[PDB]
Paper text:
MYDGF, previously named c19orf10 (chromosome 19 open reading frame 10), is a poorly characterized protein, which was identified as a paracrine-acting protein that is secreted by monocytes and macrophages. Human MYDGF has 142 amino acids and consists of an N-terminal 31-residue-long signal peptide and the MYDGF protein sequence containing a C-terminal KDEL-like ER retention sequence. According to its primary amino acid sequence, MYDGF does not belong to any known cytokine or growth factor family. Treatment with recombinant MYDGF helps to protect and repair the heart after acute MI.
Antibody 8 (Ab8) and Ab8’s Fab fragment (Fab8) reversed MYDGF’s effects in a dose-dependent manner and therefore acts as a neutralizing antibody. We determined the crystal structure of Fab8 bound to MYDGF at 1.6 Å resolution. The recognition site of Fab8 on MYDGF is located at the edge of the β-sandwich, which is formed by the N-terminal β-strand 1. This is consistent with HDX data showing lower exchange rates in the stretch of amino acid residues 1–34. The interaction area between MYDGF and Fab8 extends over about 680 Å2, the heavy chain contributing more than 70% to this interaction area. Since binding of Fab8 most probably blocks receptor binding and thereby neutralizes MYDGF’s biological activity, the asymmetrically localized epitope suggests that the surface regions of MYDGF that are positioned opposite to the epitope might not be relevant receptor recognition sites. These areas include larger parts of the back face and the β-sandwich edge formed by β-strands 7 and 8. Conversely, both the asymmetric fashion of Fab8 binding and the relatively small size of MYDGF compared to Fab8, identify larger portions of the MYDGF surface as potentially relevant for receptor binding. These include large areas on the top and front faces of MYDGF that may be blocked by Fab8. While the epitope of Fab8 does not overlap with the proposed receptor epitope on the top face, the proximity of the neutralizing Fab8 epitope to this site suggests competitive inhibition via peripheral steric clashes, which hinder the approach of MYDGF binding proteins.
Residue numbers in the entry:
A (entry chain A): 1 to 134, 144 to 221
B (entry chain C): 7 to 23, 31 to 50, 61 to 66, 70 to 81, 89 to 95, 103 to 135
C (entry chain B): 1 to 210
Write the structure that this text describes.
């Protein structure tokens, strides 16, 4: 099975530098280009550059103005993207993707899961979890930084009728998100509803019981 | 079809339906070439250590190669070792 | 460099209809063109490569056509799960191997009115000095909806934020959450908290209050 496993989310200060990794499994990186693609929030895909791991030849879109450096380590079958002099324009999700060497193989068939990079001088902060008491009920995941927060209901056993909204950035500079679920009105009183909130950057894990 | 010529010394091949191009080269960048069906050309700054097109004329610029630089056989057009000057930009085969 | 112009930038098409998305290159790219689909929070997926070839596991309703500078992606018998963003990319000449600007595809369906719910701030939050009042608009279509907050019948402005979910893969609806933020002191100074909803699916606006 082919898999591209990317490194975890990054929170970095303006002017600083990051190095992202993309570990390949199920194929040899010397047999493909490894491409890197940027996607700014609410924007389109933008090709950054590529490396041929067999000969180390690497090339970029000139718009990056030497701010991106792509490397590869054949022993560990991993490709890397280093971004320097970071600005808010560099806040984006970065994907690695493998591609071939001829018309029928250039297109990138396998992609990494993406790595989120947030360029900010703000500190990490865990959320406060409040119930949205009931039919509809939910959880309010308030005042956290950086993104993201994951929400599940009844340890993932409750998925039908669940809506986990995109977070909003408050004037405080912290995010806030709501997760709701519609349930039968007759179950209010007998059925247990727990929202499972996880915010990895602050190592926060909260299980909140939502009662009428 | 387009195909990339990859320098570094590893022997590579590209084929299409059959016309096959086998080479090893050295240089600074991977170059996108084309194969039309057989004509193999750079739409070259690479230094070829070997070349063979199989199923004829060879050119350094698309400027023919000197007769001594290559050999045309029963099914192939290949570099003549020790005489080929490492520059190839176009190969034409009529079979 | 070669620039890719994707058209239209957005489309809203019903289940069973045909979708056509076009990509124009600034010069001849000799069919070195691919199409990708991307869903929210997911990696892009290859659909079509070398202008006309279906990638492994892609449904047969997808097809690509074109040559020279003009290319099209066609979706026959559109399904509810086909909403998302689509991008073309070229692989011609010296890189950059640029992407088109993208096409956002929405599934058009019949008008569905929202189910409206209002939530007071929890006692737990009030202890911290802040009050977040939430209004939920559930499973509606089209995406356009108006939420107006009222505090003791006084129309609110500048103290609310809202967010909308991605279109549902099965029923093609949207949900919206609006949060009214007040200090604990301001919250305790008033009695009636209301969320008034205006939507194409409603004969008259719907108010939920406590």
């Amino acid at each position: 099975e082919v898999q591209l496993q990317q490194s975890g989310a990054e929170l970095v200060r303006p002017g600083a530098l990051v190095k992202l990794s993309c570990k390949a499994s199920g194929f040899n990186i010397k047999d493909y280009y490894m491409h890197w693609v940027k996607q700014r929030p609410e924007q389109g895909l933008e090709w950054i550059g590529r490396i041929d791991p067999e000969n180390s030849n690497n090339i970029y879109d000139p718009k990056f103005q030497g701010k991106a450096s792509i490397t590869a380590d054949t022993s560990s079958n991993t490709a890397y993207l280093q971004l320097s002099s970071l600005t808010s324009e560099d806040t984006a999700v970065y994907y690695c993707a493998r591609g071939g060497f001829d018309t029928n193989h250039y297109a990138m068939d396998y992609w990494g899961q993406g790595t989120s990079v947030t360029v900010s001088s703000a500190s990490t902060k865990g959320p406060s979890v409040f119930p949205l008491a009931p039919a509809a009920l939910g959880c309010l995941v308030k005042d956290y930084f950086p993104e993201p927060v994951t929400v599940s209901w009844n340890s993932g056993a409750l998925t039908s009728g669940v809506h986990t909204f995109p977070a909003v950035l408050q004037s405080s500079g912290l995010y806030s998100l709501s997760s709701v679920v519609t349930v039968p009105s007759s179950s209010l009183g007998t059925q247990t509803y727990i929202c499972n909130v996880n915010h990895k950057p602050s190592n926060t894990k909260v299980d909140k019981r939502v009662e009428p | 079809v387009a195909f990339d010529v990859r320098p570094g010394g590893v022997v590579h091949s590209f084929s299409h339906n059959t016309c096959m191009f086998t080479y090893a080269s050295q240089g600074g960048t991977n170059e996108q070439w084309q194969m039309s069906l057989c004509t193999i050309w750079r739409p070259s700054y690479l230094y070829f250590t070997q070349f063979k097109a199989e199923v004829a004329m060879a050119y350094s610029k698309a400027v023919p190669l000197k007769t001594e630089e290559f050999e045309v056989t029963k099914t192939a057009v290949a570099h003549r070792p020790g005489a080929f000057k490492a520059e190839l930009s176009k190969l034409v085969i009529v079979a | 460099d070669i620039q890719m112009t994707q058209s239209p930038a957005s489309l809203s098409v019903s289940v069973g209809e045909t979708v056509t998305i076009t990509c124009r290159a600034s010069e001849n790219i000799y069919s070195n063109l691919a199409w990708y689909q991307q869903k929210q929070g997911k990696s892009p997926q290859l659909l079509v490569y070398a202008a006309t070839n279906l990638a492994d596991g892609v449904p047969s309703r997808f097809s690509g056509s074109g040559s020279g500078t003009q290319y099209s992606l066609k979706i026959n018998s559109l399904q509810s799960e086909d909403f998302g963003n689509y991008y073309c990319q070229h692989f011609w000449g010296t890189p950059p191997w640029t992407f088109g600007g993208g096409t956002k595809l929405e599934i058009k369906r019949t008008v569905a009115a929202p189910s409206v719910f209002i939530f007071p701030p929890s006692d737990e939050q009030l202890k911290s000095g802040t009050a977040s009042v939430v209004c939920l608009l559930n499973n509606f279509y089209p995406r356009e909806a108006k939420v107006q907050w009222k505090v003791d019948n006084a129309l609110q402005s500048g103290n609310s934020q809202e967010s909308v979910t991605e279109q549902d893969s099965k029923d093609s609806t949207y949900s919206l959450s609006s949060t009214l933020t007040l200090s604990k002191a301001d919250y305790e100074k008033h009695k009636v908290y209301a969320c008034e909803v205006t939507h194409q699916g409603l004969s008259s606006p719907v108010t939920k209050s406590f």
